[PDB]
Design a protein around this ligand. Structure first.
Ligand SMILES: Nc1nc2c(ncn2[C@@H]2O[C@H](COP(=O)(O)OP(=O)(O)NP(=O)(O)O)[C@@H](O)[C@H]2O)c(=O)[nH]1
Ligand SMILES: [Ca+2]
Ligand SMILES: [Mg+2]
Lengths: 76, 167
């Protein structure tokens, strides 16, 4: 029940998802300890099927719906 | 600026993450939240030089350890951390040091033995000379006792590794 997230400055984290958490709730701590603020970043779902595309997600997305997906957080 | 790849190793609950986030963010993590996979990067200044530090924080408690060999292959400097309040964590380190030498294939690899939770003196079960005597056997490698909570020798762990790599 985890999600791997690639972060800016070549960083990465694998977070645990507890049912009920929004995407913002599960990445909160990982962003805070790196001094990253979600309001200044966009979060994407990595599309492996379409060689290199990312599809932007809302920070309020239900996190359990994304188990198994690899994500990317970028600055706006 | 120059990049330095460091890996923090050790058994579970010894403070690997607490030392790391205290170093990069100045935050003390009081909760025990087992690591799965985490890497940090921070531009620092070591000896009048601006440099990029990559810090791979490893899981002290994981089921599959096949990747450890790869983390050791790509890392330039290693911090082996144990807790002075738990004997088993100190005992577990010899295997990690042997595994690193095996992967790098040299006895001369930047390394520092760290005895964390030095602020819990009354709960100490690993003596300081006991720690120093292990480091001397490991070819006189760097050794220090730290505390992520009291901020004792936290920056020193990482700068020392940068310094050994520069030699
Ligand atoms: N008092 C004291 N507590 C510490 C110190 N360093 C870490 N802790 C506490 O010890 C617990 C475990 O720390 P943590 O950093 O999570 O350990 P870890 O080695 O990273 N664990 P794991 O491998 O599972 O990821 C946490 O509650 C943390 O607050 C320290 O120097 N002093
Ligand atoms: Ca996937
Ligand atoms: Mg940890």
């Amino acid at each position: 029940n985890t999600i791997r997230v690639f972060l800016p400055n070549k960083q990465r984290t694998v977070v645990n998802v507890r049912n009920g958490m929004s995407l913002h709730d599960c990445l909160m701590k990982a962003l805070k300890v790196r001094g990253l603020q979600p309001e200044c970043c966009a979060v994407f779902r990595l599309l492996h099927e379409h060689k290199g595309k990312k599809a932007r997600l809302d920070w309020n997305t239900d996190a359990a719906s994304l188990i198994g997906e690899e994500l990317q957080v970028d600055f706006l | 600026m120059r990049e330095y790849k460091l890996v923090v190793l050790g058994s579970g609950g010894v403070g690997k993450s607490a030392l790391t986030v205290q170093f990069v963010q100045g935050i003390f993590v009081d909760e025990y939240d087992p690591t799965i996979e985490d890497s940090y990067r921070k531009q620092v200044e070591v000896d009048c030089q601006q440099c990029m530090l990559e810090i791979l924080d490893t899981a002290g408690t994981e089921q599959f350890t096949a990747m450890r060999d790869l983390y050791m292959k790509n890392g330039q400097g290693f911090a082996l951390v144990y807790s002075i309040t738990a004997q088993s964590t100190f005992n577990d380190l010899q295997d990690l040091r042997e595994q690193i030498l095996r992967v790098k294939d040299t006895e001369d690899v930047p390394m520092i033995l760290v005895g964390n939770k030095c602020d819990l003196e009354d709960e100490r079960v690993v003596g300081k000379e006991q720690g120093q005597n292990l480091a001397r056997q490991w070819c006189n490698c760097a050794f220090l006792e730290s505390s992520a909570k009291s901020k004792i020798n936290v920056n020193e762990i990482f700068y020392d590794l940068v310094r050994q790599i520069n030699r």
